[PDB]
Design a protein that fits this description.
25% helix, Aminopeptidase, binds arsenic, Peptidase_M42_dom2 (chains A, B, C, D), metalloprotease (chains A, B, C, D), 4 chains, Peptidase_M42_aminopept (chains A, B, C, D), Peptidase_M42 (chains A, B, C, D), 8 helices, part of a larger assembly, Elongation Factor Tu (Ef-tu), domain 3, binds zinc ion, six-stranded antiparallel beta sheet, 333 residues, nine-stranded mixed beta sheet, globular, 2 domains
Amino acid sequence: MVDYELLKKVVEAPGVSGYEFLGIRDVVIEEIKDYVDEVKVDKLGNVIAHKKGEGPKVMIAAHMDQIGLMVTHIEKNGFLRVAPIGGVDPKTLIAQRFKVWIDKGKFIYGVGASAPDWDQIFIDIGAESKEEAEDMGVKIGTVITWDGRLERLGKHRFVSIAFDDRIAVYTILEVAKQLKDAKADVYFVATVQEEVGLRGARTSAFGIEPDYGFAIDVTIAADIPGTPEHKQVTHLGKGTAIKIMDRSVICHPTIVRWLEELAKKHEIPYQLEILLGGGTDAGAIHLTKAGVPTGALSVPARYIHSNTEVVDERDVDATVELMTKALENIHEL
Amino acid sequence: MVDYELLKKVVEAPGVSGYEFLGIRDVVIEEIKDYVDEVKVDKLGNVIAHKKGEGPKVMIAAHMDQIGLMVTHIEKNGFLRVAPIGGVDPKTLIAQRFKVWIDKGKFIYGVGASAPDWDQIFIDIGAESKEEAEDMGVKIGTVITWDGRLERLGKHRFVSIAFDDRIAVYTILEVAKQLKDAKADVYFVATVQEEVGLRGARTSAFGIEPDYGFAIDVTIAADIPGTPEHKQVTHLGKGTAIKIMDRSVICHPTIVRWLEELAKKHEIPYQLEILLGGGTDAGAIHLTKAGVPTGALSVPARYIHSNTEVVDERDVDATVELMTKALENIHEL
Amino acid sequence: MVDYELLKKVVEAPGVSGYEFLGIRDVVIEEIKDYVDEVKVDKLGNVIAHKKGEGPKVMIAAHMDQIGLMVTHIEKNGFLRVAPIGGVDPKTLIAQRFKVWIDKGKFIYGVGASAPDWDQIFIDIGAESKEEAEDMGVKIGTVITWDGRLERLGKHRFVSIAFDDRIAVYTILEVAKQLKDAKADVYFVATVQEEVGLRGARTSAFGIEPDYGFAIDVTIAADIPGTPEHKQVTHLGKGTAIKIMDRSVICHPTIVRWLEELAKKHEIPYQLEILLGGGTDAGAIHLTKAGVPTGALSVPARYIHSNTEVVDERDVDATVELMTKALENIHEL
Amino acid sequence: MVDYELLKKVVEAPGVSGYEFLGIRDVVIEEIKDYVDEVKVDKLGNVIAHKKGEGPKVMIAAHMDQIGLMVTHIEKNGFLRVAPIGGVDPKTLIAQRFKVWIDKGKFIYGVGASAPDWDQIFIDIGAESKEEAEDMGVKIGTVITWDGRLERLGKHRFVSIAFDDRIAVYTILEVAKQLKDAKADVYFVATVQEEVGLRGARTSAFGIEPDYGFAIDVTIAADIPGTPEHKQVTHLGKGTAIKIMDRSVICHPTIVRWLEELAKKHEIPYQLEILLGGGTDAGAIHLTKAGVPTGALSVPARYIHSNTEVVDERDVDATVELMTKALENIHEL
Ligand SMILES: [As]
Ligand SMILES: [As]
Ligand SMILES: [As]
Ligand SMILES: [As]
Ligand SMILES: [Zn+2]
Ligand SMILES: [Zn+2]
Ligand SMILES: [Zn+2]
Ligand SMILES: [Zn+2]
Ligand SMILES: [Zn+2]
Ligand SMILES: [Zn+2]
Ligand SMILES: [Zn+2]
Ligand SMILES: [Zn+2]
C-alpha cells in the first residue's frame, strides 16, 4: 500500500533537529522537485516546495527533523557523554546501537550504556582515550542517531526509527505526486526543528502567509496491553486521525467537521483525535500574523520517540487520500 | 585586561527587569553614544545603537536587566514581603544586605531573612510599622536588588552582582569602541526583560529585521569542587564560549563553525558550549519574522544568579576580540 | 586479529538454551569437523569434537547456547507475552527489535515494549488477533532472540549479540585449527544449556571422564564510567583473563599459576580474574565423578547479557594463544 | 472418570519428605505389585516397580513425599514449635487442624495458630506442659500433616491434601494397570524427597540408567479471579499439561512435539506448559550420568501447597491416557 523504497529513503536519512541538512534535506528536495514548480530552502533550513495554484494559498507541513543525541564531553578513557536533541527517554538508549555522525554521509558505530537518567548515560565507540576518540572524528557537538532500519511487521505494519515525523514527510511526497490541477496555491513544507519548539513551522508560515494551514504528524496509538480503553487515543489500522485538539492547538471546528465529511463522502477510514499533552507544527502555523485557520491529520503510531516506532500502511494511505481530497476541494471551503 | 572603571559603572547601576530605565539604561546610552551614529530607545525600553554600515545588517544583543525582588506586601510591623523578578533562589537572599529603591538614584538598606521558600522570606528595613515603612518611601511595587559591589579575586578574576548579563553589556560597549569601518550595518542592542522571557530581544529584532543575529550572555562555569568533569559545562580562563545549543536555540551550524575557525585563525582562546536547560536572547532573535541565522558567544561565569557571580578577564577579552573579528569578516559569510 | 567472517557466522546463528539445534549446532559441526578425528552430538545436544591424542585426556568447553525469550501466551489482540531463557534483564528488551523464530532458518520481526519487569513486557509482531499471530507461525513455546549483528567499534573492538559465549565458541574453533600434534587426547566440547544451570557441561564431562578440564567463557569488564577501580574486574585489551575463582568454582591453584607462567614465558598478555557472583561450565566439569582439576580462561566483555556486548580482539587472540600453548604443554603438568 | 477409592487411599496416607515409609510407601507397593514383574525399595526409600520390556528403557517418576511440618521444640506449657518440610506457607497453617504422627498409623490432633512467619507459629495439642506432651508421644522430630480428606467439588473436580504429587502417584498406578505388552522396558518409580531437592529422582535414575525419562507432577492452574490471562499458566479441565520448560528443566523439544502429536492423533485434550519458577523430578533425571532425554506431563492444580488443592478428573484421565500412549509408541521414537 505504500512505496516501501521511498519510505526507506526518508526514514534512514540522518537529520536531527538543527542538522537536517546532513541528509534528510537533500532526500526531500530530490524526491519532490519534479512534482512542483519551485523548491527553495529558507534561512533556518525549511524546504519549501511550491505547486502554483488556482485558489486559496495552503501550507501543508511535515517536520523533517528527528530526535537524537549530541556529544557534550569526551571522557579520559574515550567514552562519550551526551545531551538529548528533542524529547529522548534514557530508557530507550540502554543496550542500543547508534550511528555517530562524524561527517556528512559518514558514521561510526556506538553503544549506549548504563532506570537511568542522563548523568548515568554514556556511549562507547571503541576508543581507549579522548585523543583516540578525537582522531576517530568525534568532538563536542557531534550528533548521534539510533542505528535503526525500516522493516515489515506482519501484513500491514512496519517498524522504524523516526516515523515521527518521517512518515509525514513520506505522506506529503505522495500527496505532491498525486495532486493534479488543484484549485489552490500549494506550499509543501518540510519544516526544521519541530522537536525542540515548532521553530521551523513558525518562520516558514510567516514567510508564506497562507490562507489555510495543515500539518501532518504522528499521534499516539496506545492500543497496547495494559492500557485502559479510554486512554488508547487512536488505533492502528482504523484510519487517518483528524485532530480536534492537542496542547498546542484547537483545530478550527469548521475545518475539523469539513475533513470528517470529506472522509465520509470518499469512504476514507478515519478516527477523531484528542491529546491531553502533545505538540504539532499546527500549533505555530495557526498563530502566524493575524491568524490562520488550520487542521491536522495524523498517522497513528505506537512506541513514539524510540528506535522502534510502529505504523499501519492502511492509516498512511488514508492520510494521503484525505489530504489529497482536501486540497482538491478546499476552494469550496 | 578589562576597563575596570567602566565595568564597575555597568554592574552597579540598578536595572531589574521592566525597570531598566531606573539606572542601567542611561549608563548604556552615555557610554555608547559617541561610538555610533544614532541611539534610540524603543517602546519596551530597549536601547538600540546604530553604527551605519557597509554590508549585512547584524544585530548584537546583550540584556541589560538583572534579577531582583519586588515588594508585594508591607506587614503590620514594617517588614516587607517580596516576589522574585526573574529566576531568584531563596537560598541567596538569607542574611544578605539589599538596596531598596525608593526613587531613581535613591535607596535605603534592607536585610533579607528566615532551606526557605518565598512564604518564609521577608526583608527588614528598620521600620516599626507599615506606616513608617510607607513614610520611608516603600510601597507595593518597590524594586530591590542585592547590595553588591565589583571586587577583584586574584590575578584574573572578579566577583560582582549582575555579571549576567552586565558583563555582556560591557562587552558590546568594548566592541563598539573597537569596531572600525566594518563591512556591516551594525545594531548594538541592550535588551530589556530577558530574565522573564526574552521579551526585549523579541520586539527589538522584529523592528530591526537583521540578516544575522548574535547574542552575548553568560554561560554556566561549574568547574568547582564536587562537580563531575562532564557536567562542568565551561571553565573559567579557557576562552570565550561559542554556543552550539541550549534549550532556547540551536545555533546555526555554519555560524558556529565559522566562529570556531575565526578563533583559530586569530589565536583567540575558545571553548564549545552545550546547555541542557537554559535560555538566551538568541532564542528570540532567530525566530523573528521569516527567520534569522544566529550565533551566540558567552562569558563563562560561576555562581550565576546571586550577589557573588565570578568571571575571568581572559574570557571577557576573548569574547570582545572574537565578536569584533566576526563583525569585520561577516561580509564574507 | 580475528577471522571476522567466522565470528559473524557463530554469533548470528540462533541457538537459545535447549534449542541449540536450530542453528549454532550445525555451524559448529561444519567449522570444526575438518580439524578433528570425529564429531559426535550427545543426548542433550552437546557437540563433542575429538582430536585423538598422545597424552592426558583434556576437555575444553565453550557453551553454545545464548540467552533469549520464549512465548508464553498470545493475547487476544495478537501481542506476545514472554518468559526469559537464561538471565535476561527487562531493561534490555524495551524498544528493541527481535527475531521471532517460527521455524528452523525462518523468522519474523518483533518489537519489545513497555523500569519494567516481566508482567509489563510484551512483543508486537504486527498481528491484529491471536488467530493472525498463530497463522504467522507463532505458538506457545516459540523462541525469540534480539535482532543483533556483529559490527566493529574502533580499531580493536566489536559489538554483537551473544558474545557470551559465542566468542568462546570462536576461540575453540580457532584453537582446533592451530593445534598440531599435541601431546594430549583432546575433546573440544560446544556445550548446551550453560545459561540455565551448566547442564550440558555436566553430562558431557561425565561421558568424557577427562584428566583435566578447561572452560572458556566471557568475564565481566566493568572498566566503564562511574565504576570504582576495585570493581572493574577486568579491562578490555589488557589480555586473556585467567580465572582464580567465581561463585561456581575455585580453579586448581596449580593450574592457575601454571597458566600464568605459560603466559609470561610466551609473552601473552593476561590478567587475573575473581568474580563474587557468577558461573561457568568449569563449575560442573570439576565436580565430575571423582573430581577433575580445572582451569578457565575468559574473554573480558562489557555489557554482558544484552544485544550490545563488546569485546577486544587483542584479548580474544591472547585467549586462543594461551589455550593452544596449554594444550601443547599439558603433558608436562 | 477416576477410581475414587484408590485416589482416596493415596492422598490420605501419610508420607512427608524423608518419612514416606510411614504410610504412602506401603500403599504404593500394595497397589502396583500385581501389575509389574518386580518391586524394590532402594536405599533412600524410592519404590521401583519394573515391568520387563521389549524395547527402550523408560523411567516414569511421580514423587510420593508431601509437604508437612516437624516439631523443633516443646514449650513449657505444652505448645509445639515447628519447621517446614518442603515449601510450606505460614498463611496455610493458621486456624487449621493437623494430624500429629506419634507412631506409624497413630496420630493425635493438633491446632495451628497465631500475616505470620515461623517465629509466631505454634501447634496446640491440648497438653498443659512439656512433660504431658511428651507422655502423649511427641518429641523433637515428630512429623505433622494437615488433617485433610478427599472430597468432590461439583461434577468433575476434587479437593484434597497432597494432590501434589499424589495425583501423579495415582496416575502411574493407573498407567501400570492399563499398560499391556508395551515395546519398552518400564520402570515406574515413586520417588522420595522431591519437595526438598529432587533427591530421590536423582539416586533412582542413577541406578536405573534409563534411555528416556518422564516425570508426572502437578502444574499451577491459576485460572482464578484476579489473575491476568497471561499469568494463569494452565486451566482446569482443558487437558493434561505437556511441559516445555520450568526452572529445573527444558524438556527435549523432540519429545515435547512428539507428545503433542500423539495427543492430537488419539484425540487427548492437552495444553502446553511454561513455568518461570518451579521444579520437577525431570530436573534431576535428565542430568543423570551422560544425560537422559526427558519429558513431563502435569496435572493442572489450583491452590498448590495447601490442605485444599483442587484438580479436574478430565485432566487426570488425559494424563493417564497420554502417558499410556507414549509408552506404547516410544519404541518408534
Ligand atoms: As510530536
Ligand atoms: As540567562
Ligand atoms: As556466564
Ligand atoms: As512441585
Ligand atoms: Zn512529530
Ligand atoms: Zn516527536
Ligand atoms: Zn543572561
Ligand atoms: Zn540570568
Ligand atoms: Zn557464558
Ligand atoms: Zn551468560
Ligand atoms: Zn510435585
Ligand atoms: Zn510441591
